[PDB]
Structures are given as structure tokens and as C-alpha cells.
């Protein structure tokens, strides 16, 4: 029965995603902010895709690392072929959805990953940040406020929906994100920002003494 196999495979993907750390991406006054629960200092699940496009993921490290590399390859090639301003987070989200669906159907083991693509406006331009969440099978969803990935997402989503605030500052957004993720210490956290005030490249990591003072 093909349907039984499909349900079993979907259950496997849900179980793989569930036994993973949670990642939160939230919009604030200056742009987009990513917080990830990562004790390891070398492995990073928060990364830049392109000038104004950032990437977050939750799940098995090698799979979304390969997805990250493929997305970077696609974005750079697209930017070289036409222009830097022709690359948008929508195209990257669509490419990720198509690739994930094709891997799910054709490959023997589906990727146990959950992806989020975030995009901010260009310099000197006003636009609401865009957040796209992509599941293992290829489902794509636009979230206007926040994205939660990995682990038990129900308490995290409830806490965020209770504590989310539009036009929040950097400190307030970080405090709200870490408080919602608790439902921790300065270490074992990866914090990054897509800062819309930057001229060309928005992605910037906040680690070390800067994160110590900020948190």
C-alpha cells in the first residue's frame, strides 16, 4: 500500500524534526533576528544566503547544510547572470520547496529538515520583512510575524504569540525571543541579524562580548 508507506515516511520526517533543537526567526524594527539553540561553537544553523536574504534551518545537520550550499550556489549564479537586485527570497523559497519535494518523492530517505528563508528591504527602502517556512515534503508558508522550527513548537508559538510586538527594538526582540525559546545562558546560543540599515550585505552575527552586553 503506497499510502501506508507515505504516512510512515511522513511520520519518520516528523519524528526526525521533533528530536531537534528549536530555531526562532522574528521581525523587529531594524530587520530580522535569528536565535538558535546550538551548544556547538563550530556548527552553525544560521547563515547568509545573499545580500538581503538570510537562512535558518532545524533538523539533521548534513541535509540542511547541503541545502544551504545549494541555495548559496543558486543565489550567486542568479545574481551574476542578471543582477544583484534580481535575487529575491521568494525565488530561493520556491527553489527550496521544489528541491525538497523532489528529494522526498525520489530519494530513499527524505530530509528531516525544516527551513526558513528571511528577506529584508534594500537600503533606503521601506518594506515589511518576508518570512517563508518550508517543510520536508515541500509545503511553503508565508508567516508575517515569526517562524518557529524544530522540537515542540506549540509552547514556543504560544509564548511568541503572547509576547510578540511589532517595531520592537533589538534588545527587546532578543529578550522576547530567548524568553519564548526557554518555554538560557549567553553561551550555547547563536544570534544573527538581517539588519536593513546596512548598505549592501545585511547579515551580521552577534557573538562574544557584544552578545554578552546585549543579553
Amino acid at each position: 500500500s503506497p499510502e501506508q508507506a507515505m504516512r510512515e515516511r511522513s511520520e519518520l520526517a516528523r519524528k526526525g524534526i521533533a528530536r531537534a533543537k528549536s530555531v526562532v526567526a522574528l521581525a523587529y524594527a531594524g530587520g530580522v533576528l535569528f536565535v538558535a539553540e546550538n551548544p556547538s561553537r563550530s556548527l552553525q544553523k544560521i547563515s547568509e544566503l545573499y545580500d538581503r536574504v538570510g537562512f535558518a534551518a532545524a533538523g539533521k545537520f548534513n541535509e540542511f547544510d547541503n541545502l544551504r550550499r545549494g541555495g548559496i550556489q543558486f543565489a550567486d549564479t542568479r545574481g551574476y547572470a542578471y543582477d544583484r537586485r534580481d535575487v529575491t527570497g521568494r525565488q530561493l523559497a520556491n527553489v527550496y520547496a521544489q528541491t525538497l519535494g523532489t528529494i522526498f518523492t525520489e530519494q530513499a530517505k527524505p530530509y528531516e529538515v525544516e527551513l526558513c528563508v528571511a528577506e529584508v528591504a534594500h537600503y533606503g527602502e521601506t518594506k515589511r520583512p518576508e518570512l517563508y517556512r518550508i517543510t520536508y515534503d515541500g509545503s511553503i508558508a508565508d508567516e508575517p510575524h515569526f517562524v518557529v522550527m524544530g522540537g515542540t513548537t506549540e509552547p514556543i508559538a504560544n509564548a511568541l504569540k503572547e509576547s510578540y510586538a511589532e517595531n520592537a527594538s533589538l534588545t527587546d526582540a532578543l529578550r522576547i525571543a530567548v524568553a519564548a525559546l526557554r518555554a538560557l545562558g549567553v553561551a550555547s546560543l547563536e544570534v544573527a541579524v538581517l539588519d536593513a540599515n546596512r548598505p549592501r550585505r545585511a547579515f551580521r552575527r552577534i557573538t562574544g562580548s557584544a552578545l554578552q552586553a546585549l543579553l
Binding site: 520547496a97 519535494g101 515534503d137 515541500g138 509545503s139 511553503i140 508558508a141
Partner: peptide
């Protein structure tokens, strides 16, 4: 599968 994003049916919308």
C-alpha cells in the same frame, strides 16, 4: 503539500 501546499494545496493553496
Amino acid at each position: 503539500g501546499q494545496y493553496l
